[PDB]
Write an enzyme that holds these catalytic residues in place. Structure first.
Site, PDB file in Angstrom:
ATOM      1  CG  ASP A 198      -0.872  -4.655   5.991  1.00 13.18           C
ATOM      2  OD1 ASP A 198      -1.299  -4.560   4.821  1.00 13.18           O
ATOM      3  OD2 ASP A 198      -0.898  -3.716   6.812  1.00 13.18           O
ATOM      4  CB  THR A 247      -0.888   0.077   1.220  1.00 10.06           C
ATOM      5  OG1 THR A 247      -0.079   0.359   2.364  1.00 10.06           O
ATOM      6  CG2 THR A 247      -1.581  -1.230   1.455  1.00 10.06           C
ATOM      7  CB  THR A 248       3.619   2.438   2.181  1.00  5.03           C
ATOM      8  OG1 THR A 248       2.778   2.061   3.282  1.00  5.03           O
ATOM      9  CG2 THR A 248       4.176   3.830   2.441  1.00  5.03           C
TER      10      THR A 248
END
Ligand SMILES: Nc1ncnc2c1ncn2[C@@H]1O[C@H](COP(=O)(O)OP(=O)(O)O)[C@@H](O)[C@H]1O
Ligand SMILES: Nc1ncnc2c1ncn2[C@@H]1O[C@H](COP(=O)(O)OP(=O)(O)O)[C@@H](O)[C@H]1O
Ligand SMILES: Nc1ncnc2c1ncn2[C@@H]1O[C@H](COP(=O)(O)OP(=O)(O)O)[C@@H](O)[C@H]1O
Ligand code: BEF
Ligand code: BEF
Ligand code: BEF
Ligand code: BEF
Ligand code: BEF
Ligand SMILES: [Mg+2]
Ligand SMILES: [Mg+2]
Ligand SMILES: [Mg+2]
Lengths: 137, 100, 528, 200, 378, 517, 76
Positions: F383, F89-90
């Site tokens: 995650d 995501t980052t």
């Protein structure tokens, strides 16, 4: 192809100036010639005036746009040298600027148009003289 | 013309009726020009633009008299005959044909 | 009436205003005409962000109050409706025309007389094109497939899709072949579900020979896929619009129960009644059930034990595609089953999706059904939502080619052939119509010039070359080097625009002009 | 007259018979041929839905069998009236009232085309085209009641499907679709043309 | 004084922080750590906070000399899970045998609450009551079984353990008031003594002169026989579970149950059922057609003693204690309850985790002195 | 004129800026939430008292309101990447944004057309993405090795979050919890239940599956060798779907009949079930007082209300099947387990089932000292469960810790050797932006990033293609040697999902906001 | 009816051209004349012109009527 982009674009500021400026030589066009009609301005002070003299209509007209005010100065100088044609000098810039409006569209650098326009003018003046029917006082 | 009524609907036309219908118009007098224009688009369907040009124009030519100080009942009579004669004259020229 | 808050315009100004207003709408979208074009982020007043090189779409989104623009909004729109590809361009040509028309006006010309001038010079160009155009359908079969594609491709070069334009093109080519017939030449777009979802890249955008829909498959225990059921003719599936629940009236009710007598019979009524349906479908001999409306807890479980995968609730257009895709019949009641009205599909699986708890499903067929589903995917909404409209654009150019196999080579050349031909007839015109014809043709030149401007070529330069070359040789098709490659000649380069569209375009602009010019009076009011 | 978004201000079409919208708002369409040469037009006036589009009464029963009984009746009550139309041997079934999902689904099965909720002022031009004659019930449907054109098709003019009965040498009513690049021009044509038609 | 305007008073940290209106985000964090101090130990909610208070100041100090907080964070963990071990290693473990000890704990616990000068019968009150459902090896003991019912009035001292159990409802005002039956058999009717309640669109139509009383006099019996079957099964005291659905004990069905001298008590909340089936030894009764004498209890006494304008119910003589709390101001009647919970939880800690350290600051200091030495060795 | 009432237009220079700034701005928000030495950001919504701390990129971006298109584009790209792989995501926003940053450079100060900048990128992407596949080794076969592989992925996908602490611990949990399914990529099969108190290290995966909701009125508080009938059926007033059935009688007695009549239907259905021979009956639906009494008296335990998902879980640990038709016992897979004991998780009643038939549904219990820590440890775990859940459906793996992208850098920086003129530059820029990832990675840790990454790139430059950033000694050690594997789908997704972002934006030459209402 | 707008030629004030103004002038002169057209001839008559204070003056001297009558507009 794939070369130099010109990230910058206040291309529009030019066409914007031309149009907000040509609109000036518009209000005037009507007062050119033996069929030209006079304008009636009622100054900010309230004094009323009537005339065909362009430089004086433009002067007392209250033109607002900056590059538009420019026309009044060229008509001002038409009065300072010839003393006549203050109406014509403006109407000329009117479509001479439109000439740039047209050329700027086909991507010709304005500095090519600017510098060229000079030569095309100082060549026009010579043609005036060469066909000038000189008189004596 | 291009009328953008207070409605917001934008229209563009020539049917004089359609224009004079979008002008709202509230003046009693001047509002009859809206009526005779509508009827024209009825009993006929065309000429709507003109019925008004004329209707008006007559009223225009009546001004001189009305101003000079003449009765209106006299101008009204005068025009009355004028139409009668003019109307018959059209009927008189109305070239009827079929295979002519 | 309402005298105040009501303005009036008429010529001196007026015409300038309008002409300029057009011009300005134009100045925005000109930078989007070309395979070097660029898109424009538009934002809904609610907050919806879109990004798209599509002409119509852009000008529809610009919440604008200028009346003349409002007109060009529809001009690009109407064209999108009739063809599907003009949009970005039709307006350009239109504006150019207006500027041109105006220019003449300040030289003493009547606005309405210029109108007739343009309409005329136009009709001519339409012809000088209608004559130079080429034909595809009547030439070959494998080459028709190719040409039909070589258009879809050219039609996509000005889109984000461009990246994978090979696939998106051959996809649009296919999607249309499979739902329109060479004789009727009619592409009904209801037969092509343009559905898109997120994920992967735009590359993972495939074409489905069936349909998709979102379903968990009624009961969880149910299988995930569905085999052709041993040696059978593919898979058979129930297509019923009757709910798996105890039948009810449609006028009243009040099933008065006097005593335990009747309540005892209702008791066992609903009970085996669920078997009356679960059996019914088994009898028709099907594999999976696709019911329009939901089932009861009981009726569902039974569908489980009886190895009858189910599909609770399926919309109109939904159920209907499952029919036409699988060749089945939409069966009313339960007793109206039968092995001969089932759906002969080729497979059914519950499609997984990343980790998205949604996880829809699909119905394949192997052989080109009478229904396609272009299933678009992308790294982010906008890429998808644009790529779908980008796909649509091509799909339309493929439809226009069956409705008129005529093709003209674009690259701007198509517009140069007119400008050339129309300008010729100008010299013969002389007088007033001379100025018109010169104008019409002159406005046209802006189309290719703009392409040059965007691809980085000196406008006056490419034009003289395009004009000379397309004259010193033949009033053919020599386009602009929009991307580079060897040289001009859209033919080699494979740049093609369907004729049928091009005509429409070069009309829609002149006509729109022909209206605006006739306007010499304006009366706007406010919003009281 | 009919106006269609888009197209040249002259790419307008003169239908010989009659043309109308495409009120065809139901599932099960896409089946039913979209083109016939000499079809047997049934200018019907009312209903064609199961539970009925409107009007009702009360059904009170004290017997479990009566329940399932009255149900089977409803169905048969429709289907009959429904086949009653089939019986007229028609190819095109139009009605100023609805044609439910089941209904249109039926004709779809037996290659019979339809459309529900047709414009009132339309059926009247439909009659005058194929020479049919409106019928309110399905019972006494006699054959001089129906109508037939020279050609029927479901077009995709200006991105809008248009059912149209073209070719009708026995018509007393035509229809004409107008085109234009803006809802203002099509509008001006329709008025520029009414001023002409009315003068002819 | 809450946002609603309700006033409260207490030493229980978790409850002061909870009702305090803390605004800053990382500040709200403290309330959650005190929240969890309540969820595991049940006591020390005040201390857990004050600790973070200077443990955070420890970072304030270290962050000044430029030590990465992630070095401080991760190190602080190890320095803690090393401190806990030191607690154990110095923990003076006890057994639930030792009642001498368990009272000492609960006592030194509540020696900082308003109910401090009453720790005498309070300290063991907790102990006994916890052990009453503790067993031995039950690890986490549920405190739900210790039904406390607070009733306004009197002072703090007026609180008793109550032999049997404590109900929470009224009784009978209406037709024939029983309110007390020595040596009785109770039944938890989950049923509902009202007219015919058909769960389907019922309806009783009439179309006859005489048919009037038919409908009437008939259901008049419907309530009767049910009432008899109760007396018949030798059911002395009746308990109806509040049914908002459609009536519980019809007004009529009371004239009967009145005569029959059966003290009925309605509105027994659904969360009670389970519990009442213990303290009362009773048995839930789904229908009447399952209402039998064995599905009852051996109650030696049931009576709604009107303590004074209060009225509280009692079922004396019969894994569930039932204590009643009193005080003057509602702030008390409430506070003491939570000041008993801190004690009750004190014991729970020993139920699930034997041993106890010498509090009073001493262990805090020890872990300090210990780590302090070990520090030089790092 | 045209437009009106607050609509705003941004032409070339302006538009381009709006865009570039936006993306760059978004990226510079989540750069700190990367790297194993990265930090968390606290946020708070419309309720104010609804804080939350997180290291999840996508989380932050999803929340943070924005008005800037280009930003929302990036936000959205994050949610996508968060979907098809649950992670990165980052790493995606950042690499996406940095590419744009690297582009306005090639524009504003090099004068290169954006379309040509795209031309180059599109190539660079090919080469970059390629080298990945072309270097990604997998262990699909050898299930006893891929376990070690897969466990590393969690090991490292967990660093950076709070869990990075007891990462080794959660490493196993994740791995095991996924394997215990081995199939369904749908993570809704693992139920996470959280409760305050004690260290995170106290979290566990009850391989027996825990459940909330206690059974019966006061049934056995523990079952033995349970044989459970998992079912979902109407249990409070039947007549399923005959609606309209009124009861008109001419006397209250005829009602009284029909009344007990209904209460009979219950003793009926309840019976047809008892015929299934079970010591525990769990129903998704509820079960009122009476239908329950039946069970309490038959010994069959009544455990009502477990919704849809709550049953499906049990039906995967115990091995039963949903069912709602007891019209015949048998032909209905009945579930089973060793015990259905009632346990207490810090002041709370739960049902610890045990020894189920290969539980393809599990329960992980998280334990933190504050709700914040839980809710973050919640996703900080997700995650992990998400990647692993995907790698079983994509056995390919690659080494991260810089390595991966640094390899794609040397790839692009190489293929930028055969190229045209301007395009090359965009190409070189790509690898450049890619390289900014290990940089930003090392940055957060606190080393002289410039210096470190230049060392890294130097190894990967001159062969090796394995070295990575040991963000502890601040040296550059071997990643394959340090178990820092990463899903191939993940990295491949980032390098892809980002390039798309770039292209869609570089192509913008205008922005138009309408009159917001 | 009613003139309005500007668009280009940004001028610090009002500006009517052609028909619009040319009629305005005529209307103006017309009104100012028509007030005193009823004072012409022997059969003509005087008028009273009151101010704001209420006082006034009655007079047929067309020049004083037009002087006394506040006229604002050039052509007036
Ligand atoms: N007799 C005429 N017939 C045609 N043009 C004339 C005639 N007399 C003078 N003019 C034109 O009138 C033009 C404009 O004059 P005027 O309106 O006074 O503006 P200016 O004199 O300031 O240019 C002059 O340029 C001249 O060409
Ligand atoms: N590949 C290309 N090479 C040369 N010309 C092209 C190429 N691609 C599109 N064009 C030109 O650009 C036109 C399409 O412009 P586009 O930006 O796609 O807007 P629209 O197609 O919506 O008008 C084509 O009709 C053609 O004139
Ligand atoms: N132990 C580590 N040492 C060096 N790099 C690591 C280590 N653990 C994970 N990384 C790197 O952390 C980066 C991911 O950071 P993270 O904050 O997890 O963002 P994302 O949301 O992209 O997972 C990856 O590039 C990965 O290579
Ligand atoms: F109008 Be000009 F200056 F004579
Ligand atoms: F304008 Be008219 F009706 F021809
Ligand atoms: F740009 Be267009 F709509 F193909
Ligand atoms: F104040 Be503590 F929680 F006893
Ligand atoms: F921030 Be990521 F999702 F590890
Ligand atoms: Mg196109
Ligand atoms: Mg304490
Ligand atoms: Mg991660």
């Amino acid at each position: 192809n794939a070369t130099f982009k010109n990230k910058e674009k206040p291309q529009e500021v030019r066409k914007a100036n031309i149009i907000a400026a040509r609109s000036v030589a518009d209000a005037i066009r009507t007062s050119l010639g033996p069929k030209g009609m006079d304008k009636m301005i009622k100054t900010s002070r309230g004094e009323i005036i009537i005339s065909n003299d362009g430089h004086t209509i433009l002067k007392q007209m209250a033109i607002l746009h900056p590059v538009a005010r420019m026309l009044v100065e060229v008509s001002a100088a038409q009065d300072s040298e010839a003393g006549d044609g203050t109406t014509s000098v403006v109407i000329l810039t009117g479509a001479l600027l439109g000439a740039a409006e047209r050329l700027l569209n086909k991507g010709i650098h304005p500095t090519i148009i600017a510098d060229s326009f000079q030569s095309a003018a100082k060549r026009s003046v010579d043609i005036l003289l060469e066909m000038c029917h000189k008189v004596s006082l | 013309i291009l009328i953008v009524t207070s409605n917001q609907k934008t229209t563009i036309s020539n049917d004089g009726a359609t224009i004079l219908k979008l002008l709202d118009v509230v003046h009693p007098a001047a509002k009859t020009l809206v009526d005779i224009s509508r009827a024209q688009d009825a009993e006929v369907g065309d000429g709507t633009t003109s019925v008004t040009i004329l209707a008006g124009e007559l009223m225009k030519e009546a001004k001189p008299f009305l101003e000079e100080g003449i009765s209106s009942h006299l101008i009204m009579k005068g025009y009355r005959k004028a139409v009668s004669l003019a109307v018959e004259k059209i009927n008189e020229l109305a070239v009827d044909i079929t295979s002519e | 009436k309402d005298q105040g808050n009501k303005k009036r315009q008429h010529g001196l100004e007026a015409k300038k205003s309008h002409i300029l207003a057009a011009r300005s709408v134009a100045s925005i979208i000109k930078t989007s005409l070309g395979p070097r074009g660029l898109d424009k982020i538009l934002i809904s007043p609610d907050g919806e962000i879109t990004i798209t090189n599509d002409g119509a779409t852009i000008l529809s989104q610009m919440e604008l109050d200028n009346e003349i623009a409002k007109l060009l909004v529809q001009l690009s729109k109407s064209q999108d409706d009739e063809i599907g590809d003009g949009t970005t361009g039709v307006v350009v040509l239109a504006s150019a025309l207006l500027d041109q028309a105006l220019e003449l006006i300040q030289k003493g010309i009547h606005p309405i007389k210029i109108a007739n001038g343009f309409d005329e010079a136009a009709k001519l160009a339409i012809s000088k094109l209608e004559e130079t155009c080429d034909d595809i359908s009547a030439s070959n079969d494998e080459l028709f497939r190719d040409f039909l594609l070589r258009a879809a491709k050219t039609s996509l070069g000005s889109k984000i899709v461009s990246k994978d334009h090979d696939r998106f093109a051959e996809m649009a080519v296919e999607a249309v072949i499979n739902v329109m017939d060479k004789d009727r030449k009619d592409v009904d777009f209801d037969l092509i579900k343009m559905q898109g979802r997120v994920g992967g890249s735009i590359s993972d955008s495939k074409l489905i020979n069936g349909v998709i829909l979102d379903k968990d498959f009624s009961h969880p225990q149910m299988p995930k896929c569905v085999l052709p059921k041993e040696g059978s003719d593919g898979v058979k599936l129930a297509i019923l619009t009757c709910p798996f629940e105890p039948p009810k009236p449609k006028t009243k009710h009040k099933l008065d129960i006097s005593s335990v007598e009747e309540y005892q019979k209702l008791q066992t009524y609903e009970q085996d009644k669920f078997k009356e349906m679960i059996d019914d479908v088994k009898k028709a001999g099907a594999d999976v059930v696709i019911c329009q409306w939901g089932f009861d807890d009981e009726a569902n479980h039974l569908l489980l034990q009886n190895d009858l995968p189910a599909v609770r609730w399926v919309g109109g257009q939904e159920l209907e595609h499952i029919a036409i895709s699988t060749n089945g019949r939409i069966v009313p009641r339960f007793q109206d089953l039968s092995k001969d009205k089932l759906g002969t599909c080729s497979r059914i699986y519950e499609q997984e999706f990343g980790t998205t708890k949604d996880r829809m499903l699909i119905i394949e067929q192997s052989k080109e059904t009478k229904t396609v589903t272009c299933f678009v995917r992308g790294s982010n909404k906008m890429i998808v939502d644009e790529a779908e409209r980008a796909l649509h654009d091509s799909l339309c150019v493929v439809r226009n080619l069956v409705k008129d196999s005529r093709v003209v080579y674009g690259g701007g050349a198509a517009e140069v052939t007119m400008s050339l031909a129309v300008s010729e007839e100008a010299d013969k015109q002389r007088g007033i119509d001379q100025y018109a014809f010169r104008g019409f043709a002159q406005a046209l030149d802006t189309i290719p010039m703009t392409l040059a401007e965007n691809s980085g070529l000196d406008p006056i330069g490419t034009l003289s070359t395009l004009k000379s070359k397309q004259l010193k040789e033949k009033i053919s098709n020599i386009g602009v080097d929009c991307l580079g490659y060897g040289s001009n000649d859209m033919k080699e380069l494979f740049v093609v625009d369907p004729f049928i569209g091009k005509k429409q375009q070069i009309l829609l602009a002149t006509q729109l002009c022909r209206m605006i010019l006739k306007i010499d009076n304006v009366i706007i009011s406010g919003k009281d | 007259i009919k106006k269609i978004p888009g197209g040249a201000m002259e790419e307008s079409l003169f239908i010989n018979g009659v043309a109308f919208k495409k009120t065809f708002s139901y599932a099960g369409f896409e089946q039913q041929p979209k083109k016939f040469n000499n079809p047997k037009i049934l200018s019907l006036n009312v209903e064609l839905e199961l539970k009925a589009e409107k009007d009702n009464a009360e059904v009170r029963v004290e017997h479990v069998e009566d329940y399932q009984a009255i149900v089977d009746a409803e169905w048969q009550l429709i289907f009959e009236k429904l086949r009653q139309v089939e019986e007229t041997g028609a190819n095109i079934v139009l009605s100023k009232l609805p044609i439910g999902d089941l209904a249109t689904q039926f004709f779809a099965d037996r290659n019979i085309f339809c459309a529900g909720r047709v414009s009132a002022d339309d059926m009247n031009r439909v009659i005058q085209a194929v020479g049919g004659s409106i019928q309110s019930t399905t019972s006494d449907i006699k054959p001089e009641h129906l109508g037939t054109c020279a050609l029927f098709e479901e077009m995709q003019i200006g991105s809008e499907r248009y059912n149209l009965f073209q070719g009708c040498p026995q018509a007393k009513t035509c229809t004409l679709l107008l085109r234009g690049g803006a809802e203002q021009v099509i509008a001006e044509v329709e008025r520029s043309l009414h001023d002409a038609i009315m003068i002819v | 004084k809450t946002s609603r305007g309700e006033i409260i008073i207490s030493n229980d940290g978790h409850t002061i922080l909870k009702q305090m209106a803390i605004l800053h985000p990382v500040a709200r964090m403290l309330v959650e750590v005190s929240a969890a101090q309540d969820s595991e130990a049940g006591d020390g909610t005040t201390s857990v906070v004050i600790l973070t208070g200077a443990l955070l100041g420890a970072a304030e100090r270290l962050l000044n000399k430029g030590i990465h907080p992630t070095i401080i964070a991760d190190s602080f963990q190890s320095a803690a899970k090393r401190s806990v071990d030191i607690l154990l290693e110095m923990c003076h473990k006890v057994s639930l045998s030792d009642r001498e000890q368990l009272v000492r704990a609960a006592s030194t616990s509540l020696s900082s609450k308003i109910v401090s000068q009453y720790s005498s019968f309070l300290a063991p009150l907790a102990v006994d009551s916890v052990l009453k459902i503790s067993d031995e090896n039950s690890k986490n003991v549920d405190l739900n079984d210790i039904r406390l019912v607070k009733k306004v009035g009197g002072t703090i001292d007026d609180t008793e353990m109550i032999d049997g159990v404590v109900l929470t409802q009224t009784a009978i005002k209406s037709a024939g008031g029983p309110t007390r039956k020595e040596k009785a058999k109770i039944g938890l009717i989950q049923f509902q003594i009202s007219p015919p309640k058909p769960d389907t669109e019922n309806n009783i139509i009439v179309n006859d002169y005489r048919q009037m009383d038919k409908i009437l006099k008939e259901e008049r019996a419907y309530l009767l026989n049910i009432c008899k079957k109760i007396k018949k099964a030798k059911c002395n005291v009746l308990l109806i579970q509040k049914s908002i659905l459609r009536d519980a004990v019809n007004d009529l069905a009371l004239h009967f149950l009145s005569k029959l001298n059966i003290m009925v008590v309605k509105d027994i909340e659904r969360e009670e059922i389970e519990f009442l089936s213990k303290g009362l030894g009773c048995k839930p009764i789904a229908d009447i057609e399952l209402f039998t004498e064995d599905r009852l209890d051996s109650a030696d006494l049931v009576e709604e003693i009107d303590s004074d304008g209060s009225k509280i119910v009692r079922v004396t003589g019969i894994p569930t204690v039932s204590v009643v709390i009193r005080g003057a101001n509602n702030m008390i009647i409430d506070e003491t309850e939570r000041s008993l919970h801190d004690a009750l939880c004190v014991i729970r800690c020993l139920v699930k985790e034997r041993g106890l350290i010498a509090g009073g600051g001493a262990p805090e200091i020890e872990i300090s002195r210990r780590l302090s030495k070990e520090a030089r060795s790092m | 004129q045209i437009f009106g009432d607050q609509v705003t237009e941004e032409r070339a220079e302006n538009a381009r800026l709006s865009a570039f700034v936006g993306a760059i701005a978004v990226g510079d928000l989540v750069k700190s939430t990367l790297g194993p030495k990265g930090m968390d950001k606290l946020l708070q919504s419309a309720s104010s008292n609804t804080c939350m701390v997180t290291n999840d990129g996508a989380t932050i971006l999803k929340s943070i309101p924005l008005d800037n298109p280009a930003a929302k584009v990036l936000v959205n790209i994050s949610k996508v990447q968060d979907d098809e792989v649950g992670d990165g995501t980052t790493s995606v926003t950042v690499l996406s944004a940095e590419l744009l940053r690297e582009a306005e450079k090639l524009i504003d100060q090099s004068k290169i057309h954006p379309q040509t900048i795209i031309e180059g990128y599109r190539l660079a992407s090919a080469a970059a993405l390629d080298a990945l596949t072309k270097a990604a080794v997998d262990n699909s076969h050898d299930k006893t090795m891929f376990r070690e592989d897969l466990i590393h992925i969690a090991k490292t996908t967990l660093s950076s979050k709070i869990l990075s602490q007891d990462k080794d611990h959660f490493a196993e949990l994740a791995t095991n919890a996924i394997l215990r399914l081995k199939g369904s990529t749908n993570l809704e099969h693992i139920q996470i239940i959280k409760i305050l108190g004690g260290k995170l290290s106290d979290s566990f995966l009850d391989e027996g599956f825990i459940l909330a909701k206690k059974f019966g009125n006061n049934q056995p508080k523990r079952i033995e060798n349970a044989k459970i009938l998992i079912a979902n059926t109407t249990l409070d007033t039947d007549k399923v779907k005959i609606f309209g059935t009124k009861f008109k009688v001419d006397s209250t007695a005829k009602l009284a009949q029909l009344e007990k009549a209904e209460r009979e239907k219950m003793k009926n259905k309840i019976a047809k079930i008892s015929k299934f021979g079970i010591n525990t009956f769990i129903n998704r639906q509820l079960i009122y007082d009476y239908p329950e009494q039946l069970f309490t008296d038959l010994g069959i335990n009544s455990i009502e209300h477990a919704d849809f998902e709550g049953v499906e879980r049990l039906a995967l640990v115990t091995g039963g099947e949903v069912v709602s038709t007891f019209d015949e016992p048998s032909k209905c897979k009945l579930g089973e387990c060793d015990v259905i004991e009632e346990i207490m998780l810090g002041e709370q009643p739960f049902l610890k089932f045990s020894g189920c038939k290969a539980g393809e549904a599990c329960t992980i219990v998280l334990r933190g000292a504050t709700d914040q820590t839980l809710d973050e440890a919640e996703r900080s775990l997700h995650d992990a469960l998400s990647v692993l859940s995907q790698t079983t459906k994509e056995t390919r793996t690659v080494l991260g810790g810089g390595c991966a992208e640094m390899v794609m850098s040397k790839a692009v920086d190489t293929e930028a050797q055969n190229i045209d003129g301007k395009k090359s530059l965009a190409v070189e820029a790509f690898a450049r932006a890619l390289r900014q990832l290990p940089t930003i990675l090392a940055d957060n840790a606190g080393f002289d990033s410039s210096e470190l990454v230049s060392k890294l790139r130097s190894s990967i430059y001159n062969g090796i293609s394995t070295s990575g950033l040991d963000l502890n000694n601040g040296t550059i050690a071997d990643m394959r040697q340090l178990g820092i594997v990463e899903s191939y789908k993940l990295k491949r997704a980032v390098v892809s999902s980002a390039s798309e972002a770039a292209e869609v934006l570089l192509r913008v030459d205008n922005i138009i906001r309408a009159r917001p209402r | 009816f009613n003139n309005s707008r500007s668009d280009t030629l940004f001028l610090g004030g009002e500006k009517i051209s052609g028909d619009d103004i040319r009629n305005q002038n005529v209307l103006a002169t017309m009104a100012v004349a028509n007030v005193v057209k009823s004072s012409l001839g022997p059969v003509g008559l005087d008028k009273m012109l009151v101010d704001d204070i209420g006082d006034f003056t009655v007079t047929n001297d067309g020049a004083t009527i037009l002087s006394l009558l506040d006229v604002q507009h050039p052509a007036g």
